[PDB]
Amino acid sequence: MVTAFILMVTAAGKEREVMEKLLAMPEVKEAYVVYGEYDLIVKVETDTLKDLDQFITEKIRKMPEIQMTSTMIAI
Amino acid sequence: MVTAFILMVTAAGKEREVMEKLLAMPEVKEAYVVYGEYDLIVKVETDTLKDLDQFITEKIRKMPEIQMTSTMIAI
Amino acid sequence: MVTAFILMVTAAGKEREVMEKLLAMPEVKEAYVVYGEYDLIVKVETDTLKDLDQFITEKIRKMPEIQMTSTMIAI
Amino acid sequence: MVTAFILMVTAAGKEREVMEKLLAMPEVKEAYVVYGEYDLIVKVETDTLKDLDQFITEKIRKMPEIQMTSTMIAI
Amino acid sequence: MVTAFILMVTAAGKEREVMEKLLAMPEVKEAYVVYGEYDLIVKVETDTLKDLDQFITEKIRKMPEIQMTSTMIAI
Amino acid sequence: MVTAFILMVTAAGKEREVMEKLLAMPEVKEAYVVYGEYDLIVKVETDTLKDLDQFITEKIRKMPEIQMTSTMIAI
Amino acid sequence: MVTAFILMVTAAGKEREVMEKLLAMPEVKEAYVVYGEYDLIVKVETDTLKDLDQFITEKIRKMPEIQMTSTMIAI
Amino acid sequence: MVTAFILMVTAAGKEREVMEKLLAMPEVKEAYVVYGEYDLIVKVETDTLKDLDQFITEKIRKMPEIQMTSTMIAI
Ligand SMILES: CC[C@H](C)[C@H](N)C(=O)O
Ligand SMILES: CC[C@H](C)[C@H](N)C(=O)O
Ligand SMILES: CC[C@H](C)[C@H](N)C(=O)O
Ligand SMILES: CC[C@H](C)[C@H](N)C(=O)O
Helix, strand or coil: CEEEEEEEEECCCCHHHHHHHHHCCCCEEEEEEECCCCCEEEEEEECCHHHHHHHHHHCHHHCCCEEEEEEEEEC | CEEEEEEEEECCCCHHHHHHHHCCCCCEEEEEEECCCCCEEEEEEECCHHHHHHHHHHHHCCCCCEEEEEEEEEC | CEEEEEEEEECCCCHHHHHHHHHCCCCEEEEEEEECCCCEEEEEEECCHHHHHHHHHHHHHHCCCEEEEEEEEEC | CEEEEEEEEECCCCHHHHHHHHHCCCCEEEEEEECCCCCEEEEEEECCHHHHHHHHHHHHCCCCCEEEEEEEEEC | CEEEEEEEEECCCCHHHHHHHHCCCCCEEEEEEECCCCCEEEEEEECCHHHHHHHHHHHHCCCCCEEEEEEEEEC | CEEEEEEEEECCCCHHHHHHHHHCCCCEEEEEEECCCCCEEEEEEECCHHHHHHHHHHCHHHCCCEEEEEEEEEC | CEEEEEEEEECCCCHHHHHHHHHCCCCEEEEEEECCCCCEEEEEEECCHHHHHHHHHHHHCCCCCEEEEEEEEEC | CEEEEEEEEECCCCHHHHHHHHHCCCCEEEEEEEECCCCEEEEEEECCHHHHHHHHHHHHHHCCCEEEEEEEEEC
């Protein structure tokens, strides 16, 4: 199994709507709007790294409101 | 009382327009146009953290001219 | 209640031992060793902001093994 | 007169003692320990740019506890 | 021969579209979608530096889907 | 007198047109499109720091094609 | 299989000697000294994520000449 | 001809002495001590890219007083 945290910067004022969309996805276990350089922190759990790759490319990167991400995979 | 410093990037030709909105807000204690990656730095104070949350999420991040923000809460 | 995520950098080879010490703290709700710029991601919760201030400055940052912390307070 | 905000990263656990030292300097108008990538924010005011550079050089950079800094001159 | 690595950020939902354009170009030796701040990394080779200049300025930076690039020329 | 170098990131494919506009300004002495994290490097010379401040706010920041800048003042 | 690009900053003047050491490692597929903020780019391939972390930990991070690194896992 | 701008970080208090040594090199066309993240900005010109490669790696980065360099090649 894979557990990872994705830190994201979103367009100003869209963090809440983006968070709600992410929370509705099965891969997403937790999501919070936060203070600092990043706007959202999202915890995801997938069966494989390939699945995590697909979550990033097929879900995250197709959302225009998300601008910059940093992913940290638990080990 | 909660004190925080907010770094902001505004749309081109709008940093003065944003400063004018900021300098009319009760929560804004000081505001400066600065050199660098960010256009402005603003020191704000609210009674509680819940109030800061509302202020930043609603009055700052939804301001049309704002493109990005990074808030540093102080101790 | 205040929720925050602490991104940490520990001295080399101390990640695991630091994590076990953190997991013993009542404020720590989740802790993970991760691959990336940061060595650990820790979810903490306190009753007030003043308590978090105390926990981060007097407990967490005083741990000999911890070199850097970047705390993201949740809205 | 030159006004500038200096963001600094300190050795973990030394931010308060550093802030107190800084607060004792005449050029320092305000100083706060903050959450985020940076640990301290300081507002300084000097008569000239020359004096600002001398300040960070003779005082700031000569403080072992201070590890990294970013200066933002106010306009 | 000049070799360079180009880090690129593309518009949302366009990273595959860009990869398809890149993988049809003679100058592209390898191309990968990557995690992080950048969406793709591409290794290119040209006969001369003047050719690289033309290639990057005209075929890469004018590509409609490209939002930002950072090119690292190799020795 | 003040001499400074301004490093800038521009929208992809607009670096040349931005450079031409800057070169036409009396304050600008040299300008080059460059490889790396920055897209343009511009050398400016003004009578006072106040004039440099005005160049940044009234000229640079009103140009939508310019996205992020870093200014280094000679001393 | 996991493929990743590692960008590194080395002590000034030690980049080539470091590159040669890296090139002697089986996990390293290619390596180049480059212009820019980073001094070296290395492409590595390991069977697992676990092995990638062990690689940078046992080899990369244990090289005194290497001062800073940024890893980008390829999808 | 190849033109490049080298952004440098020197050991503390060595900026001026490093600058005078650089000004003596035929490749160096302009050199300035500056306020900011970098200590010096140096404009250099060589007849070919291969010569610049040699100049930066075998001359510049071998200078004991220089700690970091980020070279931006001009188009
Ligand atoms: C609510 C905080 C927002 C999202 C941003 N991260 C900031 O610090 O300003
Ligand atoms: C109290 C905050 C400390 C100093 C650090 N900046 C952090 O966010 O963890
Ligand atoms: C010509 C280079 C462009 C402007 C950008 N700086 C890059 O490195 O890709
Ligand atoms: C040859 C390039 C060196 C290593 C450094 N990255 C620079 O740009 O100055």
